[model samples]
Structure formats: C-alpha cells, structure tokens
Target: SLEERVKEIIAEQLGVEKEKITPEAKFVEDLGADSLDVVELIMAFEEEFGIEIPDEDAEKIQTVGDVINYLKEKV
Candidate 1:
C-alpha cells in the first residue's frame, strides 16, 4: 500500500521507528529531519516509487499525510 510504503521509507531514511510515523506528523518538526534529510527522503521516495518529485512539489510535502496523499494522486 502507498501509505505503508511511505511510512517505511520515512522510517528507514530518518532512522526512526515506523510507529513514530503518523499521518499528521511533520518531517522536520515531528520527525527530527532537517533540510538535507528531507531532500534525501524525497529522493528515496522518487527512487522507490520511480517518480520525479521536483523542488516545487517537494516543498509542499511536509507531513506524512502530505506525502501519502500526494503520491496517491501522483503514482
């Protein structure tokens, strides 16, 4: 499932437990990720999902729900 995959990627990339990743959780504020972490996270998503996530689009993706919802529509 897209939601499951998104949470897994976020957990692995950010070195956090998947249980810590919730829908409304913010990457930086809640997940302890920085700018570089977020960039790499986005890249990881692109690689796993085989999609291109541009800067403009990436900027809008901050929360776990945001990523799940966006990719649900995108891929």
Candidate 2:
C-alpha cells in the first residue's frame, strides 16, 4: 500500500516516472521540487491521507523514503 500510494502521489505531483521513483529520491535536488513545491507536496499528502503534517515535521522530511517512513509510522 505504501509503495502504491507513494508512486501515485509522486507521479501526480512531480510527473515522475512511476518506475523511476525510488525511495531515496530527494525531493528538491533529485525530483526538481522548489520550496513552494515542497510545501504544496506536504499539503497534498495531508489532504490525500487525511492527516496534518506539522510545519516542523514537514521541514524534516526531504526525500521519498522520509515521506514513506513517516506515513508508515502513522498509518
């Protein structure tokens, strides 16, 4: 479920290749996300998962693995 959901979210947000979206992909440097894009991605995840990611926690996460691990803990 985590893998499927992550792929869907990343593809929808960053136009990333589903097959190429690895867990280590860095949002900014690797995936080409700007500051606003990062914020928007957090909001998108929050909405998609019905959870609120605190600004501080959001700031701590910078890669796909981080997001997956964060949600895995909560879910």
Candidate 3:
C-alpha cells in the first residue's frame, strides 16, 4: 500500500491525475513542479509518512520511483 499512498500524496500535492503519475515521471519535468512545490511535497511526505528526508537525500529524488524506493527502504 505504500505505492498507493505515495501516489496519492504526489497526485494531491502536484495537482495531477493519479493515472498520469507513473514511476518514471520526473517531479519537475513531467509533473511541472517548481522548487516551492518540491519543498511542499517534502513537507507533505514527512507529515504523511512520519519520516525526515534530509536535504542531501531529498535532492537525489528526481522521480516518483525514487521517492517510492527511498521510503520503502526507510520505512
């Protein structure tokens, strides 16, 4: 259910259709998220998942799949 929850969060935060939220979709390029949007997304993830994603690691998350994998490992 992590995938479902993650996809929900990404879709809600980015205001995109859940069906369009593929694993390979880039947060910025594909989803049209800006720096502020990304920051809000990080906050949303932290709140939803109860985890702290540091700046360095957060910077490495370029796609939806990256976020899913990182949370899978951490959680």
How close is every model to the real structure, measured as TM-score? Answer: 0.93, 0.91, 0.94
For model 3 the TM-score comes to: 0.94
Stretches of candidate 2 exceeding 4 Å from the true structure: none
Query: Which candidate tops TM-score?
Result: 3
Query: If both were scored by lDDT, which would come out higher, candidate 1 or candidate 2?
Result: 1
Q: What lDDT score goes with residue 50 in model 3? A: 98
Q: What is the lDDT of residue 36 in candidate 1?
A: 90
Residue 59 accuracy (lDDT) in model 2: 89
lDDT of 1: 0.91
Each prediction's Cα lDDT score? 0.91, 0.86, 0.91
Q: Please report, as a residue range, the 10-residue window in candidate 1 with the lowest summed lDDT.
A: 4-13
lDDT by residue (1-75, candidate 2, tens digit) is 877887788788888788777889899988888887888889888988889899899988898999999999997
| lDDT tens readout by residue for model 1, 1-75 | 888888889988899999989989999999999989999999999999999989899999899988888889989
- RMSD of each candidate? 0.8, 1.0, 0.8
The window of 10 residues in a row where model 2 has the poorest summed lDDT is 1-10
In model 1, state the lDDT of residue 67. 88
